[PDB]
Amino acid sequence: AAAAGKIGAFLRKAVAAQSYGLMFANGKLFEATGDALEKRGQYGFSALQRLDGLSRRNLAAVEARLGALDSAERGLKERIMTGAWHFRHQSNAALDDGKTAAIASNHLLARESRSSGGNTFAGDKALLSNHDFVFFGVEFSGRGKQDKPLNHKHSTMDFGANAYVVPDTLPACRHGYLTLTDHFFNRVPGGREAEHQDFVGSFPQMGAETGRWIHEGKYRQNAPIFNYRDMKAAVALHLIEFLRDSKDAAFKAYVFDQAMQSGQALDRVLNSVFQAEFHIPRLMATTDYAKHPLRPMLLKEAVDSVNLPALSGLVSSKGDAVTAMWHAIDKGKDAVAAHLLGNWRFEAGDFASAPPGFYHELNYALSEHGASVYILDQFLSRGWAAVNAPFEHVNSGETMLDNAVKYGNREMAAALIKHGAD
Amino acid sequence: IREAFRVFDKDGNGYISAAELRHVMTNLGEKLTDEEVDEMIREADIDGDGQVNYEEFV
Amino acid sequence: NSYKMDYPEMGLCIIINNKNFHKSTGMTSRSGTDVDAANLRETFRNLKYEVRNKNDLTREEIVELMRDVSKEDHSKRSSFVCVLLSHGEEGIIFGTNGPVDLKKITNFFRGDRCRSLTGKPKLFIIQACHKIPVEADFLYAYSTAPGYYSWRNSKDGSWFIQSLCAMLKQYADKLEFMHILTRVNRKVATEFESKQIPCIVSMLTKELYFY
Amino acid sequence: NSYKMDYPEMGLCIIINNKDVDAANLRETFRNLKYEVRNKNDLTREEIVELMRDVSKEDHSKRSSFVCVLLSHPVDLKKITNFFRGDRCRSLTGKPKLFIIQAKIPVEADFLYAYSTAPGSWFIQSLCAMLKQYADKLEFMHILTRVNRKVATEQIPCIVSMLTKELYFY
Numbered sequence: 001a002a003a004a005g006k007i008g009a010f011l012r013k014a015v016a017a018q019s020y021g022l023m024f025a026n027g028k029l030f031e032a033t034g035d036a037l038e039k040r041g042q043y044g045f046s047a048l049q050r051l052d053g054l055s056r057r058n059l060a061a062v063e064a065r066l067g068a069l070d071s072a073e074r075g076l077k078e079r080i081m082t083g084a085w086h087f088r089h090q091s092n093a094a095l096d097d098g099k100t101a102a103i104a105s106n107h108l109l110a111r112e113s114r115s116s117g118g119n120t121f122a123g124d125k126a127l128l129s130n131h132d133f134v135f136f137g138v139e140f141s142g143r144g145k146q147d148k149p150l151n152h153k154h155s156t157m158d159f160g161a162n163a164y165v166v167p168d169t170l171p172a173c174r175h176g177y178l179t180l181t182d183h184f185f186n187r188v189p190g191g192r193e194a195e196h197q198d199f200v201g202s203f204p205q206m207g208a209e210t211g212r213w214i215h216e217g218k219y220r221q222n223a224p225i226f227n228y229r230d231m232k233a234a235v236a237l238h239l240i241e242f243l244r245d246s247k248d249a250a251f252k253a254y255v256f257d258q259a260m261q262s263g264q265a266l267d268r269v270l271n272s273v274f275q276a277e278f279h280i281p282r283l284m285a286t287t288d289y290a291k292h293p294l295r296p297m298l299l300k301e302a303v304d305s306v307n308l309p310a311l312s313g314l315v316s317s318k319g320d321a322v323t324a325m326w327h328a329i330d331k332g333k334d335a336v337a338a339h340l341l342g343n344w345r346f347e348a349g350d351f352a353s354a355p356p357g358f359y360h361e362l363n364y365a366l367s368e369h370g371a372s373v374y375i376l377d378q379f380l381s382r383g384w385a386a387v388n389a390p391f392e393h394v395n396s397g398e399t400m401l402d403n404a405v406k407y408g409n410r411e412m413a414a415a416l417i418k419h420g421a422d
Numbered sequence: 423i424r425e426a427f428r429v430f431d432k433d434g435n436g437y438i439s440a441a442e443l444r445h446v447m448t449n450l451g452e453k454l455t456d457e458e459v460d461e462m463i464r465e466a467d468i469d470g471d472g473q474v475n476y477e478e479f480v
Numbered sequence: 481n482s483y484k485m486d487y488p489e490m491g492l493c494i495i496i497n498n499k500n501f502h503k504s505t506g507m508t509s510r511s512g513t514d515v516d517a518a519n520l521r522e523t524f525r526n527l528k529y530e531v532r533n534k535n536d537l538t539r540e541e542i543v544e545l546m547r548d549v550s551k552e553d554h555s556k557r558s559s560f561v562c563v564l565l566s567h568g569e570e571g572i573i574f575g576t577n578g579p580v581d582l583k584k585i586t587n588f589f590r591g592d593r594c595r596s597l598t599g600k601p602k603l604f605i606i607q608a609c610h611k612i613p614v615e616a617d618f619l620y621a622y623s624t625a626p627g628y629y630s631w632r633n634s635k636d637g638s639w640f641i642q643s644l645c646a647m648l649k650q651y652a653d654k655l656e657f658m659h660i661l662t663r664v665n666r667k668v669a670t671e672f673e674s675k676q677i678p679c680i681v682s683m684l685t686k687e688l689y690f691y
Numbered sequence: 692n693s694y695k696m697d698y699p700e701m702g703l704c705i706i707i708n709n710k711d712v713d714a715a716n717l718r719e720t721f722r723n724l725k726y727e728v729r730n731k732n733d734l735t736r737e738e739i740v741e742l743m744r745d746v747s748k749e750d751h752s753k754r755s756s757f758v759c760v761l762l763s764h765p766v767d768l769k770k771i772t773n774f775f776r777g778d779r780c781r782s783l784t785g786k787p788k789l790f791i792i793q794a795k796i797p798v799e800a801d802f803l804y805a806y807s808t809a810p811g812s813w814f815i816q817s818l819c820a821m822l823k824q825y826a827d828k829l830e831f832m833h834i835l836t837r838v839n840r841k842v843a844t845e846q847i848p849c850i851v852s853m854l855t856k857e858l859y860f861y
């Protein structure tokens with residue numbers, strides 16, 4: 001009997017519970033608000049019941065506070081609610097794998113299985129503790145994946161240069177909550193710092209009101225979270241709330257000119273009024289997706305987010321190999337260094353000056369706080385750096401062993417005193 | 423609730439219950455991805471995946 | 481009445497940076513201060529100065545570094561500039577390991593404890609993101625703010641000590657320091673709108689011209 | 692680059708003597724600058740705070756600046772600055788708030804202090820003479836630096852300037 005669904009759909013819940021356990025156990029905001037759970041290592045379905053209740057209350061509150069609507073502002077709740085949604089990812093790494101996309105979260109990418117990459121500004125680990133979620137930007141166009149997305153940037157930052165568009169129909173989106181703004185930066189961008197300035201410049205009065213208007217102001221730094229069932233109604237129910245506080249020609253003549261064309265007249269409206277996000281649990285495994293090249297890569301992004309297939313094409317000559325190696329030195333990317341050394345033969349002549357854009361000499365770059373032991377040892381073995389030579393510009397007088405002792409790297413201090421005299 | 427108990431007909435009688443068979447059955451029969459099933463089995467923790475012991479889970 | 485800064489060489493410059501704080505304090509780290517240090521390096525080296533970077537020092541290192549420059553012979557140079565990039569509160573500056581009082585940094589430059597700089601401009605530029613002492617030609621430019629927004633990218637450090645470099649790039653050959661500082665304080669709180677503003681304590685008895 | 696002083700009036704001028712010839716000199720050396728001098732005497736240090744609260748609520752939309760001289764000798768300056776944050780005083784926002792004081796600082800967008808030493812008074816007499824000689828040539832910061840030179844030659848007065856543009860008196 002093909003009853004493997006009864007275990008797959010249960011283990012998916014089991015996995016998602018452990019990822020809502022972190023967010024509902026840690027986090028300043030949920031403890032302050034009263035929506036926090038305990039630390040128990042292995043959580044249960046309570047981490048799903050709490051999300052369901054939170055979504056129910058966060059939708060019912062705005063529904064009750066909002067008026068009973070009318071014949072005009074209830075059809076919008078069917079043009080929007082019964083639509084087609086697709087999620088964008090935009091990351092610079094190498095994720096296609098030919099015919100299988102697998103995107104993991106920070107808490108899985110760093111759970112003793114350390115694959116190089118990462119993009120997070122300090123602050124997320126304490127306030128929310130949602131660093132176990134594969135974030136996704138939402139697209140309301142509704143058309144097929146194989147057409148290049150009309151959006152290119154999130155709230156302000158263009159994360160990657162390689163769109164990974166997926167359809168809503170995946171079974172992994174069942175337990176993915178949605179929030180109308182960035183969960184930490186709960187701030188709708190103003191009418192001037194928004195993408196597609198042509199549409200927003202067409203409607204002048206809209207920009208004055210689509211600015212920084214926060215949500216769930218009972219504690220300032222909240223943002224409502226809606227589960228899969230309650231994520232499509234709450235977008236229209238908040239569009240209505242914004243519209244019945246607006247006096248503009250867009251309040252009629254475009255928001256009801258989008259009815260017969262739900263593409264660039266619905267997406268350009270919703271992604272300008274809001275900046276939504278989708279938060280899938282630990283991993284997103286799929287066989288159907290769309291890898292759309294939006295923008296050509298850069299050496300900084302190819303080295304930061306380690307992507308050998310892209311790096312081997314970006315690097316064309318030794319004049320770029322030296323730059324790639326300098327990028328790898330000041331980040332600790334051992335794999336990139338190994339690739340470059342295996343595909344190039346260097347010489348100590350070109351490592352005697354920092355290329356324009358770098359702020360440290362070689363002996364200080366190899367010995368700073370974030371430097372890697374593998375690259376240091378390899379450079380010492382090739383003899384491209386003197387183990388006993390003092391710094392001239394920064395910290396003059398000191399030596400590499402002094403840096404290794406200051407910061408406490410025992411594996412580096414031993415490698416220095418062993419490979420030299422000091 | 424009893425369905426969660428009794429779908430595990432291919433039982434190891436309160437034991438690991440053939441973790442390799444669990445790895446390979448989800449691969450062949452419902453068309454998942456290995457990067458997802460190896461995560462599910464990792465979330466199944468250690469050997470001794472009792473059909474009733476594992477799902478004292480509510 | 482100008483200052484007559486035309487000595488053989490134009491003073492000394494000291495830049496101190498703290499970016500990777502020691503874990504014994506609790507502060508995680510400071511993001512993107514190396515670009516600030518390099519910008520100050522280039523800007524002040526453009527003014528015929530002798531900059532000396534010192535990255536990630538401790539209290540006992542900072543105090544001894546300041547003391548061993550106090551006993552130098554600044555007789556042939558017309559001024560002295562000291563810049564302190566670190567973390568701290570209203571009137572305390574933090575090393576990697578702990579806090580050192582700003583009062584005990586300028587003690588070695590009080591004039592009664594050093595004769596090399598008698599009535600000489602001892603500029604201080606603190607960017608610690610106010611119980612200040614008083615003596616002779618001391619000028620403190622103090623600021624405490626990470627910025628207004630755009631955290632993402634730490635685009636060129638912080639507003640204060642990039643606007644300072646911007647004004648010293650062009651204005652520093654026709655205006656005097658009090659005017660440059662006012663224009664810096666104007667660019668800040670202007671490209672800062674939707675909140676903290678720098679303060680300028682100045683005990684100078686003359687007009688500071690960098691040419 | 693320069694604060695506008697072409698408004699109907701060139702601000703107020705309030706002199707307080709919390710305890711003689713120095714304030715008397717201040718009278719004319721600020722009246723000749725086309726000011727509205729409001730002299731005072733010894734007070735208890737709560738009614739003075741209420742008075743600055745009163746002058747905080749006034750149509751300063753026609754004034755060009757604001758001056759507050761404090762010839763003192765047990766009260767908090769924060770309880771005086773609190774009424775002048777500019778957020779409530781909408782008619783003074785973007786305009787100078789001079790606080791010449793003779794006996795910790797509150798940081799705010801557009802203030803300026805003139806702390807001095809208690810030992811007429813040399814500071815006040817030097818300020819009046821300097822403002823009489825050079826008022827139409829130099830801006831205020833240079834005036835105060837020359838005052839510093841005079842005081843230190845014949846403790847040094849501090850200058851806590853949070854100004855955003857230049858001052859001038861013509």
Ligand SMILES: NC(=O)c1cccnc1
Binds near residue numbers: 089090135137154
């Ligand atoms: N994974 C991302 O870079 C991303 C995209 C959109 C929103 N949040 C994160």
